[model samples]
Target: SFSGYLKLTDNVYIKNADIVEEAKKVKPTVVVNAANVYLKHGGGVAGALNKATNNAMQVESDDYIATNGPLKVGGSCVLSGHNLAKHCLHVVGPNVNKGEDIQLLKSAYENFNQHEVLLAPLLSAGIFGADPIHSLRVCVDTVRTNVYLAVFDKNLYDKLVSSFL
Candidate 1:
């Protein structure tokens, strides 16, 4: 079975747990979504949160920072909506070939100052295809507070069920 927790520092930790499960437990202040500058909750964390909130996320995302999003690589935007958690922060993560590791930290920490217990999905490791362990490390090193990185090890945890203890 796959089970682990890598404590990055005093407060930050990387856990191979369900993102939705952990966020639900925390009653978090914010859940950050990797987006396409326009705060499009179309993929990654955005899709999850949108689905979890019963379309509330999509409604809010539609109007979340109505900018065309020249968010480029190292840019972000924060929004509030009635998702499983209290708010969702949207960021324009490095798209594919863009430097994903650094870009994730830049956007996440920029919004970190306002809330405790933030949930962040794997920035480019999933579809965008960054090295999973390296991407995990970058986030672990960047955060020093209540930031939790969601993990899913298919060999151990069921993608359709539980991973959180």
Candidate 2:
């Protein structure tokens, strides 16, 4: 069985049960729980569950951005239709028409700042379809200059690279 604990400090630990009633005293950014459904299938809710179980938190958003396309040299960024959150920022790398990797990273950051999306989900189409590895390499190379990547799962990490390159 899985157990939960609270970090009272860098080295201090407290049982969740002891603090369940005093949630405000714990002062956690967010609370996460994973259900059996996550292990059986994958979807937005499952994704959220996976993140939560792993201690990942979500922020309120007016919109979520979903982009399509591959990352390539001289490629153009692809922005998807804004469904709603606070904002949606999509970036298509690879297959770029102008080698605008830098611009793409800048745009993602700009959107993150503009919309205050603290925990934006980065997704890829898949390696078979978009060459995930190459796409992530480009994104990593460019995003590293400006953004920080907080990966959650090994499977997801491998998926990010295995899909395109």
Candidate 3:
């Protein structure tokens, strides 16, 4: 089941929902893929997206990397969202080991500003080791408008509810 969201602005919210499922439901203009630099789609939000899109993004990513090299941290590249959404923003988040990457995390969220409607996961919060609260704060602050953060974890949900709502 899904809980309600903390409204960051009239258009932006921290939603307690599965990002992929939410994307399917809302059909946002673009979906953000919180990925690693390789754009491998091996696990986490990237894996779910690759599964949902029938590996279309992986093929595109192979070509993208072949041409542009690994995506830099805080950098993003666009891919076809297939039946999942209109487009996908494949952005790399900063690893916790980087020690001073709050700016990079903010950069990842800020990149979504150009798009009108967006659905995203909490980038860098799982295996990448960023604290959920820190990620949530950066997302709430840096993302401009018309963004929905489809947070699926209970810890993050509670934090969003208690801290922001």
lDDT of each: 0.60, 0.29, 0.80
Q: Is candidate 1 or candidate 2 better by TM-score?
A: 1
Cα RMSD (angstroms) for every candidate in the order listed: 5.8, 13.2, 2.6
State the displacement of the C-alpha of residue 3, model 1, in Å, after optimal TM-score superposition: 13
Best by TM-score: 3
lDDT of 3 by residue, 65-138 (tens): 89989988888988888888888999888988666476688887778877877788888887778887888778
Q: Quick one: ranking by TM-score, best first?
A: 3, 1, 2
34 Cα displacement, candidate 1 (Å): 2.0
State model 2's lDDT: 0.29
Q: How high a TM-score does candidate 2 get?
A: 0.28
Per-candidate TM equals: 0.72, 0.28, 0.89
What would the per-residue lDDT of candidate 1 be over residues 1-165, giving only the tens digit for each residue?
112556556766666666766666665777777766665566566676677777777776676455453455546666674645677766555655654554554454455546666777766556566655555555555655577666656543233123222
lDDT of 1: 0.60
* Model 3, runs deviating above 4 Å: 1-4, 97-100
Arranged by lDDT with the best first, the candidates are 3, 1, 2
What are the runs in model 1 whose C-alpha is more than 4 Å off? 1-6, 67-72, 97-110, 154-165
